Amino acid sequence: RVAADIGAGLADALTAPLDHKDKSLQSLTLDQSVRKNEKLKLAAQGAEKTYGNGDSLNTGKLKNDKVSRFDFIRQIEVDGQLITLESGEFQIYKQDHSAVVALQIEKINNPDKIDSLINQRSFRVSDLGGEHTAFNQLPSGKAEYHGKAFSSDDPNGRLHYSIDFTKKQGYGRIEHLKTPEQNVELASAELKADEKSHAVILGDTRYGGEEKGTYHLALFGDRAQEIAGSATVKIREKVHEIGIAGKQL
Ligand SMILES: [Mg+2]
Numbered sequence: 466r467v468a469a470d471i472g473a474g475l476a477d478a479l480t481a482p483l484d485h486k487d488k489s490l491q492s493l494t495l496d497q498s499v500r501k502n503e504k505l506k507l508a509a510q511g512a513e514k515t516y517g518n519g520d521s522l523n524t525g526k527l528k529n530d531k532v533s534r535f536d537f538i539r540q541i542e543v544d545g546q547l548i549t550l551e552s553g554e555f556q557i558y559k560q561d562h563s564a565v566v567a568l569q570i571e572k573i574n575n576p577d578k579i580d581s582l583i584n585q586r587s588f589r590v591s592d593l594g595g596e597h598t599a600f601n602q603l604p605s606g607k608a609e610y611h612g613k614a615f616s617s618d619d620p621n622g623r624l625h626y627s628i629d630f631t632k633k634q635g636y637g638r639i640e641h642l643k644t645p646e647q648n649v650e651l652a653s654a655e656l657k658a659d660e661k662s663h664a665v666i667l668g669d670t671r672y673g674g675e676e677k678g679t680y681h682l683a684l685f686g687d688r689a690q691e692i693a694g695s696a697t698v699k700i701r702e703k704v705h706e707i708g709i710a711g712k713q714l
């Protein structure tokens with residue numbers, strides 16, 4: 466009930482201009498969710514907007530600490546035809562300094578009939594952004610983060626994570642997902658700078674006392690108020706992706 470209470474933010478995000486006085490995070494650049502030859506149509510609450518690579522999503526209009534959901538289609542022009550490559554649901558979790566996007570795919574183009582769709586489900590974490598914390602401007606001390614872990618058909622996992630800025634080390638946990646084996650250790654890993662000199666943590670996921678995949682957490686906010694990113698976990702023969710985001714209380 467509370468999770469489903471997203472106000473009128475979906476229609477508003479699709480139809481309103483960026484207003485930097487709106488509640489932060491005010492916008493997210495869409496880069497991973499739509500590639501340069503593609504277009505992404507998001508629809509909800511009676512509205513629709515077309516996005517291309519590099520376009521801004523107006524997260525300022527969306528509810529904080531909730532997953533906002535949009536129906537999407539992904540299209541491309543190929544050989545004189547407008548082809549739908551994917552259709553599904555675009556899920557975005559909004560915080561004060563950060564946002565993370567996951568895509569639940571429902572249909573893809575038929576590989577043998579490109580202008581028709583077939584059912585084929587998958588789930589991936591795509592865009593991740595906000596006010597990145599500069600690695601050279603990290604806060605002092607330590608911090609604990611609480612928030613959401615969301616995977617395919619399961620938005621009710623929890624994230625708990627601890628960073629010691631002085632030791633430049635982080636570790637944490639994914640809890641409460643319905644699939645037991647998704648509730649991985651986010652094993653201790655080094656806090657370091659990425660290519661853009663942003664503070665990030667790249668670590669292993671573990672379950673059953675073995676490595677099962679990797680996780681990526683980026684720090685956001687001038688005091689690293691928040692973290693957001695993704696985790697992968699291999700369960701049987703399949704790799705599962707999990708969106709994760711949290712904030713200091
Ligand atoms: Mg544009």
Ligand SMILES: [Mg+2]
Binds near residue numbers: 597
């Ligand atoms: Mg930067």
